[PDB]
Design a protein around this nucleic acid. Structure first.
Ligand SMILES: C[C@H]1O[C@@H](n2cnc3c(N)ncnc32)[C@H](O)[C@@H]1O
Ligand code: MET
Ligand code: SF4
Ligand SMILES: [Mg+2]
Ligand SMILES: [Mg+2]
Ligand SMILES: [Mg+2]
Ligand SMILES: [Mg+2]
Length: 354
RNA sequence: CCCCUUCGUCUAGAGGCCCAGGACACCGCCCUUUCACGGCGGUAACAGGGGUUCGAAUCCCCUAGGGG
């Protein structure tokens, strides 16, 4: 029994089940997440008998890091071992903050055409310990909170491999741990779950946890979205934005706005005609816009909008009063930029034959 | 017998620099451009009780909880 699979409720449960008081769950979480301890013999403020009781009944096993790559950006990407397979995790330092992109499945069940995770197939969901484990290893490797004196991580984004809303069972507990004060103590506002639009699971999310929301929109109408982000064929743009607005109603994390992700595919969806449509489309949705220049990956039929097109496109949106930021491209030299995470996946869907 | 207990969390603190300071969280406002969620602001603690002293988070006692 591995305590990295457990959130606070559950660890309390666990400690009651050992005839021991529930504040013990707070102590152990502090060692685990504030110091990145994987070793009960260091928990100096737990009496020696219980300290030993734990070693018999439980453990703290994060997946192992088996690769590391540094970019001129400063950006780092670690590959973690997940049985025979690998998912990948990205650390992004900016001046006043540090951000971890976290993987949430082994590949992705979805088929976005501009995504490299999509082109590897899909194997399985990640367990809680394999999600929060990514935040655990990255915190230890960077410099643990009460070990260097600084928060190693200030923001997390569920923007690694996989679609988060197709693994709510594990995504939510893991986000719960991130937010927890005896966990990493991060902020609602600085944990951004991004989703391609699995509407029912978003409604479900609303009833489970309040967390900042971004959406992989990527087109200004269904005819295009059908082609690049195929799940649109099952939950279309209007259905999705309705769901989004349902989430935003009951959410402090988002501060009344959703972040719109829109990847910039050269001469596909990135002309000023599209910006005009996009502005219209979003007239009834309080948001801010994040333009993402496309990051390439082997075999793709696409190209990256030139900066002139991006610049023009963004200015149209700005005419209509939208906050429009171009996401700086980070980790491209090591295939760690958004979309480039292929990991190592044993596809179980036969993505190839088809 | 000895040591520890200060906002949600980690802490600042040595008889007056403290009706308790910071960071983060939380909450609020704003995002018509700081964004791989951004800017600003605000609420919030001396474990509980009794003493010593002009004055106690700080010194003494008792209690509860925790460690050797
Ligand atoms: C994580 C964010 O990046 C987007 N995304 C997926 N693939 C790529 C790529 N090759 N380049 C840029 N962005 C991508 C997702 O659709 C999501 O919005
Ligand atoms: C590479 S995408 C990562 C998060 C989710 N799949 C989304 O597309 O928004
Ligand atoms: S984009 Fe998000 S959803 Fe679409 S494939 Fe890549 S990962 Fe899966
Ligand atoms: Mg929190
Ligand atoms: Mg306390
Ligand atoms: Mg102190
Ligand atoms: Mg924000």
């Amino acid at each position: 029994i591995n305590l990295l699979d457990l959130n606070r409720q559950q660890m309390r449960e666990f400690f009651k089940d050992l005839g021991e008081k529930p504040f013990r769950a707070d102590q152990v979480m502090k060692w685990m997440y504030h110091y990145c301890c994987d070793n009960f013999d260091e928990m100096t403020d737990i009496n020696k008998v219980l300290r030993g009781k734990l070693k018999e009944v439980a453990e703290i096993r994060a997946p192992e890091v088996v690769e590391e790559q540094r970019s001129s950006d400063g950006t780092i990407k670690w590959a973690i071992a997940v049985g025979d397979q690998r998912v990948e995790t990205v650390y992004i330092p900016e001046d006043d903050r540090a951000t971890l992109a976290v993987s949430s499945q082994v590949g992705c069940a979805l088929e976005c055409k501009f995504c490299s995770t999509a082109q590897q197939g899909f194997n399985r969901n990640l367990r809680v310990s394999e999600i929060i484990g990514q935040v655990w290893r990255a915190a230890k490797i960077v410099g643990a909170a009460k070990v260097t004196g600084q928060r190693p991580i200030t923001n997390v984004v569920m923007m690694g491999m996989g679609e988060p809303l197709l693994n709510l069972n594990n995504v939510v507990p893991a986000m719960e741990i991130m937010l927890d004060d005896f966990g990493f103590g991060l902020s609602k506002r600085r944990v951004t779950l991004s989703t391609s639009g699995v509407v029912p699971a978003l409604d479900k999310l609303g009833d489970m946890i309040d967390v900042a929301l971004a959406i992989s929109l990527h087109a200004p109408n269904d005819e295009i979205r059908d082609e690049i982000v195929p799940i649109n064929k099952k939950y279309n743009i209007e259905t999705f934005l309705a769901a989004v607005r349902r989430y935003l109603e009951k959410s402090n994390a988002n501060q009344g706005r959703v972040t719109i992700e829109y990847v910039m595919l050269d001469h596909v969806n990135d002309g000023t005609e599209h910006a005009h449509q996009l502005a219209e489309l979003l007239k009834d949705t309080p948001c801010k816009i994040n333009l993402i220049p496309w990051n390439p990956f082997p075999g793709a039929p696409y190209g990256r909008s030139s900066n002139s097109r991006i610049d023009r496109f963004s200015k149209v949106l700005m005419s209509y009063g939208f906050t429009t930021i171009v996401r700086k491209t980070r980790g491209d030299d090591i295939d760690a930029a958004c979309g480039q995470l292929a990991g190592d996946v044993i596809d179980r869907t036969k993505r190839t034959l088809r």
